[PDB]
Amino acid sequence: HQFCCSAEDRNIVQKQWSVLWGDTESSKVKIAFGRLILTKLAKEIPEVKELFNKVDIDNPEGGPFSAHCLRILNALDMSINLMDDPEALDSALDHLADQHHDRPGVKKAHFKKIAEILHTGLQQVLDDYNALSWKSCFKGILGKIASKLQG
Amino acid sequence: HQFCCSAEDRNIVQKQWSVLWGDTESSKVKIAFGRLILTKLAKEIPEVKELFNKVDIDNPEGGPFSAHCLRILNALDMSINLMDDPEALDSALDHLADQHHDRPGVKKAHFKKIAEILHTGLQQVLDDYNALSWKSCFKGILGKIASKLQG
Amino acid sequence: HQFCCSAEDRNIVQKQWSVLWGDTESSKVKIAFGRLILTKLAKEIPEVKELFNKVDIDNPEGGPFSAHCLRILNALDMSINLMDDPEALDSALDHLADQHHDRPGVKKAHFKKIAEILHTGLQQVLDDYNALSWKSCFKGILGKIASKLQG
Amino acid sequence: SGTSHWHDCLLRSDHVTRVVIKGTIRRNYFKSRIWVRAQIESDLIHDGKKELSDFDSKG
Amino acid sequence: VFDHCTKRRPENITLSVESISVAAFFPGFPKLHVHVNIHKETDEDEVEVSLPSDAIYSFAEDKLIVYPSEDDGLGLVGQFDGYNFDRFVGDIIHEASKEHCARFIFHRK
Amino acid sequence: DCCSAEDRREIQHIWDTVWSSSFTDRKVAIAGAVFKDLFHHYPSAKGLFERVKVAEPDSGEYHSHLVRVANGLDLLINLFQDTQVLDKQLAHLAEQHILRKGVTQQFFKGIGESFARVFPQVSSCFNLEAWNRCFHTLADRISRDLPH
Amino acid sequence: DCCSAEDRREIQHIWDTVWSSSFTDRKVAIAGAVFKDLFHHYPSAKGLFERVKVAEPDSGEYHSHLVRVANGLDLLINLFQDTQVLDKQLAHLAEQHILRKGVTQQFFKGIGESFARVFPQVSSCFNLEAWNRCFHTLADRISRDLPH
Amino acid sequence: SECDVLTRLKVKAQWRRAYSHGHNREDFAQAIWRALFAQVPDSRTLFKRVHGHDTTSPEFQAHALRVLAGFDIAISTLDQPDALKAELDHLEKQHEGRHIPDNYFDAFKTALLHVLPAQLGRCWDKDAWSACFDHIAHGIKG
Amino acid sequence: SECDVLTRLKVKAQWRRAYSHGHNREDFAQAIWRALFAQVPDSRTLFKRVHGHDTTSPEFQAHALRVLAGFDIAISTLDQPDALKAELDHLEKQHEGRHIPDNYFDAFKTALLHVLPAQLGRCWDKDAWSACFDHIAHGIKG
Amino acid sequence: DCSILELLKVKNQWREAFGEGHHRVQFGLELWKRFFDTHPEVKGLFKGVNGDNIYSPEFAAHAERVLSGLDMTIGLLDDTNAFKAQVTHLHSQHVERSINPEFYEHFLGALLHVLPKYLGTKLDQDAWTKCFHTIADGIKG
Amino acid sequence: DCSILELLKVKNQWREAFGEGHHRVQFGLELWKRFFDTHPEVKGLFKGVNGDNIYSPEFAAHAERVLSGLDMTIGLLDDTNAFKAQVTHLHSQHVERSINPEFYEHFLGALLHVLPKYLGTKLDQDAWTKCFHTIADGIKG
């Protein structure tokens, strides 16, 4: 619905997000950013690092973890690009919630933290960043992804 | 389509294949050849022998396994004779793919092996053997039969 | 033909050449430039000065020689403007070759020299000068003018 | 058929060009586009006499 | 009639005569510009084709020779009955092996 | 785009209009042209033939070499309907080429290209597509087990 | 077959699909491939690039070198519509190459060939003819005053 | 052709041109899907969970986008073989258990290879795309 | 096109196919002649000595055959430039003194280039034939 | 301390200023105009390239070389090995000339002065100074 | 002493026996069958190519190579330079193997025995022996 993550909010978010991926090695940037966010999350809340054992987080420069950072960054990209279509966005976010439910140990507090980390990083990388719109929208996105968590 | 197992390719294959079955005890030859191929496959890839437990492969001279060798050889004969009619051939091969799908444990690698064994044997028994045409066509045939396999 | 003095080459040459003649006293500039080129040629190859005796080169500020500098500069202007139409250009250049043939003592080496002088001057006066295109084209132009020379 | 007027790349005078449609493929699983094959012919009066300049093309 | 070499393996082929050039000094072998038109509709697609080709007619042999336009050795040769001229047999032949691999019965439309 | 039986029959048929004589002149001329093309496009390969005197292209040694090639190709094409024998001869030729160091698969792709460039110049109704599809088959067997 | 204005505009346009990034990965990969080709065809030249650790080719030193080349070529191409500046930079690059003994004109022809071999593999609609006609221009200026 | 270091670079660049600008991305995806289902309509039953009966449904849009995202990771890592292997293993796990004939993968390939040149419209190489798709698909199958 | 080493080889092979089998050879010759005289009938006066008025006369048959023999030497030696130059000089001497306009040589060429594909009927190259004929004719003229 | 986000930002803004060929030349020339305007003590170093005349071909070619090298280093900011190698290569190209090590601070000054005129975004001065210094540090002995 | 008419004749008859692909294979195989029948002492030399089994692919490919080389030499009979070069090339291919130089006479024997079965004309034995010897002489040291 309107006001909280409105149409213009979504337009701002998409327009500003688009700035990052200018060149042909966007994969490099996505991996770097994802690695940053994730390792920072593992530092802030140490109990989290164990949850990424299957993607080899202990070797963040490694293949598996890089591919995984691409996974999250592409999910984030997808969800941002899907903000035009609320129903499709809702469906995709729902699938993500399902996926994070099947990983026991993942908690809502982790999502609160990663929200903080995310906004902090975006303030740096993005030259133009409307915090009101971004936070308005990501409250709902991250909210929906963490909505099916047991804890 | 043309080039890969062309019209002339099919003519060659049929003409050369026809040489084997000259006399009235063609059944004896089909059973011998099928038994050879199959037991050789079971030797090359030992995990395969278990798959033929229901046709009594442990007694290859036995009734059930002989009748079964007739089954495969006749399927092969049929598919060769059907190369004039691509649509009918496709339908028959599809039925075979269905049948091999219902046998869990059957894998594409087995078909690769049996292709090798088949061509090696045919080089011996057939006095006139155009390897290019035969391999061109059987790539497609065995391909289609193994097309519905899980592994 | 293409590559050597191509269509775009000619476009560049014309566009850049157009810059010189902005105002109403273009005649003054043509005379100055022609006088410069010619006297420089007479200095570089002293045997040349005698050839311009009939146009009073010894008084380069004089009437006859000024009118003559206008003659050459206008022939050059014409040949540049005619580069759109290869056949007409060829005809005009041919007429020029005829005219320079009727002046015994004029040699191809003189044209090589005046080519050098020309390009050196143009590098200065023109603010935008694509040497590749200019040299590509003038090789052909000066080539054709000097094509009917005995020496 | 039409007249080609050149102003770049080549130094040709105005001349006839023909686009000759030679074939089309339209996949029933992707009708959004038709895949065309064609012959491009040009009548060039290059060196006193006439000469055809043609080539095979696809798009 | 039969066919095992043509690209599209069509049901029917339309041969359209577009022009005829007869050299006054050599009238026995007129040159034709013709188009071979094929229209084949399979499951995966629908294909239509109009292949411009050069041909010669031989009065001596009552025979049309259509030189191939595509990148196969496939030429069309129409043999006339000698008396009909509203029907010919069109054999498709490999320009090289001389192998006869397709035949169509053509009628004047 | 495999090498069909039709392609092989085609090549076998057209083959007697490209060289093929009781005299070697056409073989020398045409094969010679093939190599002029090859060396033009991959000049590094020209060094591999000093043993046969490429530097003197009119020498008996180089001529005889060209003829050896031409006849080798002849042998290959003649064996198109005898796949077993073709396989053995293909292997033989392959080892003959393994003994020569510096001969790569890239050079083989190159010579395929030059053949395809030369043959249609010496005979009309030469099926280029067929030639390409079949050469790929021959060369890929000769040139495997060579540096890539 | 000179280097036309069209050729230069062409090269300038296609150029941003061959490497060109805020990251050096593509430059390293492609230039690296160019040199693999060069050394494959003219192995004697491989000895010159040690200082740069040619020998260990994952050495920051060799990478940085490849990037230096790529960017040098970038600089050259960007100067295609500034003939005076192009001339000065061409001279500069030339002297930089004269300081290195053992670098010949033949090696330059070679690298032209390898560029022409590599570029069409990394981007479609790459005008090879234009590239050749223009490279000849660049190299013949860089590599004059060197030894054949 | 085969999936060289170079032709991988080519495919990677072209995929950048086709996918990276989230405008018509869901439409690109859906075009691919209409083509696939047009070739092998029996495959729609595999996608009941995600509304394969209606490719305009939000659930199926979300799906097709998930797909293109995975494929994007795969293409993006063609020059990073460790990561490529990782993503391919991941996709393989996501696909094992599902009875998917080679048939359907050929349908997917043909779909992609018809929508791609429609998207780019210009400079593209169907052989490089064929090779690299074959590599990725082989990775997903096993 | 131009008379390459290669296209010379092509012309040579095709000429073998057309001329070398003395069956319809005098008829081939005479066809060429009927075409030539059809184009430029005024040229018949040059052949009074050899009965140009009746191309079926034995004297003119003998003639046309002499011609085709000379032309055969010329074609046969396209790959032997010394010999070719020799035969061309010889023909030139045999033709000097006779007032033969380029006109007539073009007639001859056109005749040959129409009878040839009628003879071969199959694989032939009019461009190669054009080039090599031009070479031989230039040789005969000077 | 030129971290991931720093070098990412600098990479982006650099792409803005240098990635467009239509204003790359103006950028270089204006950088130099500013540098020489505010620190004419520096001009002596560039006699080899007509530093007294920045509108000359010699100096133009120079500025082009500069921006090229700067592009290389900014682009290698994430590859530590190749970075160090490139920066020591730059070092070799500068150590022979008696260059006051505080001239690099002035260079950065001119760079930061000219940059926003070619940036559609707001200049991240922190990121730029940090990365520029991790470069200059390596260039200097 | 293999003169013009000799080599012309041998060329023609060779074209008869080898120029037709439908009986080239029979020709080669029968040549070998005869050779090995009348001189089994020779078979040891061909262990590399299953000389004990002429109906095998190995030996077939061999016989094919033989006839090909023989074709080359017969075809170079008129080009003395290229001839000598080709014959020394054949020499290099035979010198490594301890081959009794009178085995070549036996080879010629089998050749002359098998040839008329594939000739529509009468075998010119003089021309054939003369040319075969001018070949073998060069093959031998």
Ligand code: HEM
């Ligand atoms: C920033 C918003 C987030 C997004 C967009 C996101 C997205 C994703 C995606 C796309 C996957 C891949 C699943 C698959 O393909 O199988 C994944 C996996 C996973 N997520 Fe996240 N996630 C987010 C936040 C979080 C948080 C806060 C946690 C708590 C630590 C978390 C924990 C995990 C774990 C443990 C996996 C396991 C992956 C594996 O084992 O293969 N995620 N996430």
Ligand code: HEM
């Ligand atoms: C060479 C091409 C092959 C042909 C033409 C062929 C044909 C057949 C046929 C006709 C049957 C009878 C099915 C029925 O009537 O119920 C059969 C059964 C079977 N096939 Fe094959 N087959 C081929 C290759 C393979 C290979 C490579 C495998 C791998 C081990 C395999 C595994 C089996 C198994 C396990 C059965 C079950 C037989 C039973 O228990 O009754 N087949 N095959």
Ligand code: HEM
């Ligand atoms: C730069 C290309 C040149 C052009 C466009 C050019 C053009 C002309 C023209 C238009 C005339 C006037 C002829 C008339 O109107 O009757 C002329 C005269 C003449 N030119 Fe040039 N010229 C060129 C280069 C040269 C050079 C290199 C020489 C060698 C000295 C030369 C020698 C002469 C001489 C001796 C005359 C006779 C002067 C007179 O009696 O009026 N020209 N030229």
Ligand code: HEM
């Ligand atoms: C088109 C397929 C080719 C065929 C059929 C062929 C045929 C032959 C033959 C018959 C020989 C003589 C071997 C002997 O007499 O023992 C030979 C030798 C040789 N080949 Fe090829 N060749 C082919 C392609 C190539 C290519 C692409 C290269 C790379 C440059 C190459 C490099 C060589 C070399 C260096 C020799 C040694 C010749 C000598 O030193 O006497 N070949 N080849």
Ligand code: HEM
């Ligand atoms: C395609 C035109 C070429 C360009 C644009 C180019 C570019 C460059 C550049 C930018 C450098 C760095 C010099 C410096 O920064 O001090 C360099 C160095 C060098 N060049 Fe080239 N190069 C080219 C062709 C060649 C060729 C064909 C060779 C012959 C193998 C060659 C041999 C060398 C050597 C030996 C060095 C020394 C590198 C070092 O010591 O660090 N260059 N080149």
Ligand code: HEM
């Ligand atoms: C190489 C091309 C393909 C790629 C990159 C790909 C990738 C994917 C991805 C990313 C998912 C999402 C799974 C998840 O998020 O857990 C998925 C699911 C799925 N794929 Fe594929 N796939 C490909 C080809 C195919 C083929 C040809 C089929 C056969 C029609 C197929 C059948 C399925 C099915 C049935 C699902 C799950 C549907 C559901 O969630 O209900 N895929 N695939």
Ligand code: HEM
């Ligand atoms: C390249 C094509 C031609 C060839 C090969 C050719 C060759 C010959 C030959 C072999 C002869 C016989 C001379 C002798 O043995 O005494 C001859 C004679 C002659 N040619 Fe040609 N010629 C050609 C074209 C022409 C042309 C175009 C004409 C002009 C109509 C022409 C006019 C004549 C005449 C008038 C004679 C002598 C008639 C006579 O014997 O009384 N020829 N030529």
Ligand code: HEM
């Ligand atoms: C991190 C910022 C800088 C970078 C990236 C840089 C890079 C470069 C490059 C690439 C060259 C050309 C190398 C050659 O071919 O010789 C160069 C030359 C030079 N640099 Fe710098 N430089 C920087 C800062 C400075 C500073 C602060 C000074 C002191 C004014 C300076 C003084 C010079 C001089 C005098 C030359 C050579 C002049 C000549 O060749 O005639 N540079 N620099």
Ligand code: HEM
């Ligand atoms: C003038 C008649 C002969 C000709 C034209 C001829 C030609 C050839 C040729 C082309 C080869 C294959 C070269 C290769 O290995 O690539 C060969 C191999 C050989 N020849 Fe002869 N040869 C002749 C006479 C003989 C004689 C009389 C003997 C003695 C029995 C002999 C014994 C052998 C042997 C043992 C080999 C190699 C077997 C192998 O390849 O494993 N040849 N010869």
Ligand SMILES: *[C@@H]1O[C@H](CO)[C@@H](O)[C@H](O)[C@H]1NC(C)=O
């Ligand atoms: C050609 O064939 C199709 C059926 O195969 C038919 O519908 C069409 O009308 C035919 N055209 C003619 C003129 O026979």
Ligand SMILES: [C-]#N
């Ligand atoms: C998040 N993984």
Ligand SMILES: [C-]#N
């Ligand atoms: C399966 N037999």
Ligand SMILES: [C-]#N
């Ligand atoms: C100059 N006149």
Ligand SMILES: [C-]#N
């Ligand atoms: C190959 N010689």
Ligand SMILES: [C-]#N
């Ligand atoms: C050069 N590097």
Ligand SMILES: [C-]#N
């Ligand atoms: C696919 N899913």
